[PDB]
């Protein structure tokens, strides 16, 4: 059957925005994932799960009668899609167990694991997520072992259907860099937003770089994708190195007995994959990787050993049974134990990508230093297991349970409690009009607000206007939200805040996060006013502002708006079309189709263009909310041409005349393009729609104002 | 980007299911099309459109000067993807508007016409719908160019993305038939559903069979192509020859000057498509399908002056400026109008589809009594062309404002008035009573209530259990109906319903379709009841029965379930796997995948399938309301195989013993298989599910009684 995606391979993809609608889900509406967890035995759970580790299965028996390191394993794929670039991937919507990450060839076999851990999502049902099922699992497998954890949050819950998600432009599995949609480029880049040195793997090949088995090199790549999905190096060697502290690979025979991938199989593999026709096709005989190492004397409990192994050998490169590259120690004693047999022991195995760990300089040196120092070591993966696993979960408000941790951590982009009587209606209106009064403008007003709370991304749930970091290095000097000006509104909000906080009794006060929000409330209200609608904007106090300390630099970089459609802003020429970067701010955004519509079409209107330039801006009265933008953009008494001196900006003249009315950029003119985008942007420029415009304005822009308000979920 | 529908090509796609979300929708949650339109001024409306048939633009300038031609055919086009296979295309949800429809080759400059209509459509917003205005536009075209319609019903709400239907396998437009994905096979059988002969086609291609300018190889491809779409011969012709009395087409020169299809255009193009190089690209110079004809001496005047040419002319094979096959009168004067050069005539000119209503024998009768019989072809036209554009809106209850007819036609299945007080509450809790004192099981009566409603389709809203067709010749016979439980099952109602309704006073009586469905719900309550749960099945009184006179069992035809997942059915072996045509079903019920679950997994245990198959049936309490079906289909315990006999069966057998426990189809297998629908069956396969599977099937079951009650819409 030929579909719309085949006749038009390249236009723009809104069922994007049109994911997780109530139709998917089979939850009621009313469902509240927070407080049915809220209610689960989380220490019966446990419990359960404790029981689990060693209660092996026939159809896929445990490596040394304990499912710890496969289960380990498991969480460390969920959280190891994560991506910094756009906060995409993550443990925390329980993706693993959909198209596509449920087949890439790194998950091969957590089929079998997800599927051990069936009964007992099936005990407890709704009250925990498979998403948090999966990381509890994890912490359990690691505390089972001997390994105290950092702690735990609940809170995920579930989604009931695949995530749109750039994962790369490879039309084979694993391809190696260079084929005709090579992610790499250049001095061995990996494009943005990417994380992963080639389709379907979670960070870099174990062999090494493209099968090279070069730990140097490895060590190079591996720097790379840990960055991208927010690991320094410190917490790089912690990982890895804890993580390999446990269980073993899976490589017993040639890879060619392995067959079909779970979307793939056949109906009768109900739901598994990677079934092998290699004797057993199952424990001693299992094939997953291809590889066949076991790096501890002890796989099943918590040890120093992996460091002692690193250190203690030197390395001689092999081919495991499948034909793969390895690292067997020189002259070693057999000394690591069989998974099956109790009569067989090994020689101490290791990846080209253990090797990094002692072969690249700076990774050397924190190697040997937990060598040396193991409780550095123990508390540094313990830290790097939480955070690995918490990434993408959001402000400490949203972590559910009885065993979250206490220290507030640095990553967490932290908000300090509010200790105070918070401002009421009363004191709002009173802001409100001193911030009128001030002179600042309705495009002051509503950029300054629009660039404080479009910052939230709702993959990671990273960003916002909580906090107030809009005053802080590195948002107050991003080129989108035009420091200068920025500077001057803070500078007149700050005042009308001093003043307003030292006249106050009993300790109320007004955060600057809030009043930033309030103040855009304001703007939005006089513009309406300006069209002659008498409109109040809902605004909820209780943000509070945090401190330079508390805000990472560098964490924060990622979350710069290179390409903001909703003000006409793009930092330079990509590849990728802009409007297909503005319906991507959109997801990001969590808006709907008819959201992204009436709130840019708004904003246009409003000033919030970077620059004060005019494109888009389809109004002669700037500074008042109305639906100009769609009723001139819609206006066939218009002709529209892309400019000699640049091909992304439009002219559009006036038919009969020639003369000149308005110019455009791509997103602009995507709404009266794109068959979907124009049957929106019709109802708004109906004759009957002014008053559902500025009303569906106003909601939007409430619910921008509010994505990161989970203090008040 | 790769997909998951590009790795994994042949999956299920549940996305289809989804469509037509409150996310996409920018009319609010509570907007009522209905309402809207009741208050619409439709002689208002009319007189606006009336003024615009001779209001040229300069951008599409109208030919005559005078743009009804255009307008029928766009009319016409919008009607005519109607398909009788699966009730798809037709013109009540405005999906010309839409990818891929608004780009077909048959639809160019459809584009224009519709953008003509952009100030009308902005001016009345949304009480009147794209979808009805492209229908009142055509019709009042017709009107202002002298032909008195049968009259026009409002009512269709329009959509927001493109429907999810099988136009065809072809990859390339208009290809000709016998390709790698050929819709033709054996003699000339076109594949089932399709309704077109080629892809990007309405019906047929105008220079004959594959471009084979034959007028009697057309009329083949005429006659089969309009009986997929629900038209006979008397129609057949009074539609081609009643739209072929206005305007022209248009081929002034070669077809490589157009350009890009809409949905391939620039973004400068705004929404248009097709724009051509020669010449001034439009109004004189038009390309649009490549050919050059006008067929009568008063374009813009109703007459009988199409078949007086057809009849009074011999015709010669002759060529466009295109390049096209048509036909010319031999040695006719130039009595033809020109479309923008008064000094200017031509010979009168004809399509080889337009001479086989003289040269297939079948088709002349009807065209010579036509032709001697003017007043007899209006009347035929005229109730055509009400029939074409309103054959997918469904029952009369759906029809608005004030140009209704009020003539009820037998292509309607129409259902007679209720004229007496309908049963209430306590009468329904008696009957219920009543039917289950009768020894009805719950087998017999569910699956008799799911025969009677699940005929519906949400394509063309046809079928439903209103009426009681399902008494009648043809339901009463379909093999899914099982005929002789069925009338067994029929008999002892009618004698529960003779009773009840002789017992009565003041009129008060019940219906047989009311008690079926009635009936139905009582099988439901005894269900839950066996199962330990006491629930009230929602029931709403008011269907009436039609007579064997008002059901064309013809037309009823194509609503026989020859796959129904719901009762494990399938009639034949199909190219289509059965888990595919499962999906196909839900959404012609109109059931998300939720839905589409909860729904057969019940059904399985109330013994809806049919012949009483155990196929499914994964419970030993079969009669009784319970999750049994997902907690035995998610079992690890047991492993499923397809057996020796037939691939399409599967085993499931205890994993350790041996021991068979249950067989099961695709159908069965699939929900336990893909990714999506297994995470479902885990919602109701839990041990906290069984009030809420309960509940959601209780609701899922009413819905699909209620399907065609729009007399409480
Ligand atoms: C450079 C990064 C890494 C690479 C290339 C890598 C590679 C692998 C490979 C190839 C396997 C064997 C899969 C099989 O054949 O069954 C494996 C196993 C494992 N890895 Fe990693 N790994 C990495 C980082 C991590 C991290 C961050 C963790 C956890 C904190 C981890 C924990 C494990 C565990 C527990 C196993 C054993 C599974 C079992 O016992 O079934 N690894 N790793
Ligand atoms: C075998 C069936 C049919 C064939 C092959 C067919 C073919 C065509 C073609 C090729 C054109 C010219 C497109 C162009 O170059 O602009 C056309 C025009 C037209 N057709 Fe049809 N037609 C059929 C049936 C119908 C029916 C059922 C109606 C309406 C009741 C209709 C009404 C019209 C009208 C009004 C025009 C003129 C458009 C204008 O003035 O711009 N046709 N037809
Ligand atoms: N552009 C490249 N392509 C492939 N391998 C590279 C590239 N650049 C560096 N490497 C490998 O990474 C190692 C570490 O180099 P560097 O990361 O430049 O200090 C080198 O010695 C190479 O083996
Ligand atoms: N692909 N996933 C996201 O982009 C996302 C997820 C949840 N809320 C917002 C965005
Ligand atoms: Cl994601
Ligand atoms: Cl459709
Ligand atoms: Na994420
Ligand atoms: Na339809």
Redesign the pocket.
Known sequence: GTSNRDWWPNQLDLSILHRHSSLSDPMGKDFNYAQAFEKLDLAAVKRDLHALMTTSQDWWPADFGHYGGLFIRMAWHSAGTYRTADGRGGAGEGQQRFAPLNSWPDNANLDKARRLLWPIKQKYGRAISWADLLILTGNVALESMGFKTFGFAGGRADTWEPEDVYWGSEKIWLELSGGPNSRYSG??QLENPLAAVQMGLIYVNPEG?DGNP?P??A??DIRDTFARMAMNDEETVALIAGGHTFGKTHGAGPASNVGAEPEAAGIEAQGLGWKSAYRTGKGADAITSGLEVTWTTTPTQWSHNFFENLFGYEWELTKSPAGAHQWVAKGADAVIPDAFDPSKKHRPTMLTTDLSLRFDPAYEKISRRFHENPEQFADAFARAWFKLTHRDMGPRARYLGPEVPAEVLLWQDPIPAVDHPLIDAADAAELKAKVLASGLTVSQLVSTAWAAASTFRGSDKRGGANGARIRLAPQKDWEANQPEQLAAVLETLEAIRTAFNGAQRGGKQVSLADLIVLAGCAGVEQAAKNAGHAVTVPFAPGRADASQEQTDVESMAVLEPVADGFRNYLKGKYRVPAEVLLVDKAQLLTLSAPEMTVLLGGLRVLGANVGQSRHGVFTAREQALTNDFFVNLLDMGTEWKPTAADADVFEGRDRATGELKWTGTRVDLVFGSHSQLRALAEVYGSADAQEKFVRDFVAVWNKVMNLDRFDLA
């Open positions: 001095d061995r770089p070069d140097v090199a060590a190079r």
